[PDB]
């Protein structure tokens, strides 16, 4: 496959994609601040199980806009008001402190977003889009929580900030670990936890951490929607992923692993 490869300095060239890099991408950071817009664009060959997603949120007077689009054809990365949502961010701690400024979405297909991440919670609330929406998806284990919600109606993302400790136990229990089979996901590190909220599937996923080529694995609790290559790709920076989810407590046990015609 081939794609444009561009550094943020605006210099680009055609890149012959490495074996198993099967996507092209454009990553875009846009910052509007009291009159000025700044923009940084990267392009490159990427590894699949990624989707298109965008997000805009307020920090003080600034607006920050994050975007990735991906595509499959040679050089397909070449060239490139509405619903009212709540918005806030974490850098200024505005999500957490409760100062939630209002934000009109610039595009008809954007919806209200809420996205929580931690391994120091990071909270971003604003306008954006993903293929799922409206919907939500989520994963948590002993030290990890990722959550995403999209709503189709006005200021629907208003509310206290979603924290794991306020979702009641599901009744489902699943094995918990992250790392590889020797480090972080050894048997001594893999143990049962109580699932919470709508995260009522046991999950295991393996793929290749993208930044460095190492094997990665994760186990825990998930929404059914989390059991999806792109979402796991996004959340853990992974690719060429095998996922399984199952709805019997402990069915996440590493001794119950089975490859899925990856194959
Ligand atoms: C992300 O959305 C882009 C935007 O269209 C998708 O790329 C489009 O592909 C269709 C089919 O070739 C074309 O009509 C458009 O020309 C493409 N858009 C542009 C601007 O080139 C792309 O497929 C999406 N990524 C995924 C995986 O959904
Ligand atoms: C597994 O985990 C750590 C690094 O993540 C490392 O010490 C070990 O060698 C890894 N195994 C492989 C195959 O990368």
**Token pair 């200021």: residue:** 155
In order of start, what are the domains of the chain with their CATH numbers?
Answer: 1-81 (2.10.60.10), 82-167 (2.10.60.10), 168-263 (2.10.60.10)
Give the long-range contacts of residues 66-71, CB within 8 A, separation 24 or more. Answer: 66/28, 66/29, 66/30, 67/26, 67/27, 67/28, 67/29, 67/30, 68/25, 68/26, 68/27, 68/28, 69/25, 69/26, 70/23, 70/24, 70/25, 70/26, 70/46, 71/23, 71/24, 71/25
Distances from the Cα of 185 to the Cα of 16, 83, 146, angstroms: 35, 43, 19
If you measure from the C-alpha of residue 73 to the centroid of ligand 1, how many angstroms do you get, rounded to a whole number? 10
Strand partners, 244: 204
Gap between the Cα atoms of 178 and 248, Å rounded: 20
Token pair belonging to 139: 């994963």
Nearest ligand by distance to the CA of 26: 1
Resolution for the entry shown, Å = 2.4
Q: Is 186 in the pocket of ligand 2 (CB under 6 A)?
A: no
If you measure from the C-alpha of residue 101 to the centroid of ligand 1, how many angstroms do you get, rounded to a whole number? 32
**Token pair 């991906």: residue:** 70
Cis omega (within 30 of 0) on the bond before 263? yes
Q: Is 180 in the pocket of ligand 2 (CB under 6 A)?
A: yes
If you measure from the C-alpha of residue 136 to the centroid of ligand 1, how many angstroms do you get, rounded to a whole number? 23
Question: Which experiment gave this structure?
Answer: X-ray
């Amino acid at each position: 496959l081939r794609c444009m490869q561009c550094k943020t300095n605006g210099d680009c060239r055609v890149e012959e994609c490495a074996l198993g890099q099967d996507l092209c991408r454009t990553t875009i950071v846009r910052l509007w601040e009291e009159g000025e817009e700044l923009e940084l664009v990267e392009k490159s060959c990427t590894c699949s199980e990624k989707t298109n997603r965008t997000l805009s949120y307020r920090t003080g007077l600034k607006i920050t806009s994050l975007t990735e689009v991906v595509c499959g054809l040679d050089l397909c990365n070449q060239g490139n008001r509405y619903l009212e949502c709540i918005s806030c961010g974490s850098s200024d701690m505005s999500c957490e402190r409760g100062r939630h400024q209002s934000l009109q979405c610039r595009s008809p297909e954007e919806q209200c977003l809420d996205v929580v991440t931690h391994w120091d919670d990071r909270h971003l609330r604003g306008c954006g889009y993903l293929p799922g929406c409206p919907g939500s998806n989520g994963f948590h284990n002993n030290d990890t929580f990722h959550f995403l919600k999209c709503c189709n109606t006005t200021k629907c993302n208003e509310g206290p900030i979603l924290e794991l400790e306020n979702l009641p136990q599901n009744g489902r229990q699943c094995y918990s670990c992250k790392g590889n089979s020797t480090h972080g996901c050894s048997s001594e590190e893999t143990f049962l936890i109580d699932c919470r909220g709508p995260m009522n599937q046991c999950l295991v996923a393996t793929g290749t951490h993208e930044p460095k080529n190492q094997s990665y694995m994760v186990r825990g609790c998930a929404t059914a929607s989390m059991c999806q290559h792109a979402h796991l790709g996004d959340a853990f920076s992974m690719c060429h992923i095998d996922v399984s989810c199952c709805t019997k407590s402990g069915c996440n046990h590493p001794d119950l692993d089975v490859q899925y015609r990856s194959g």
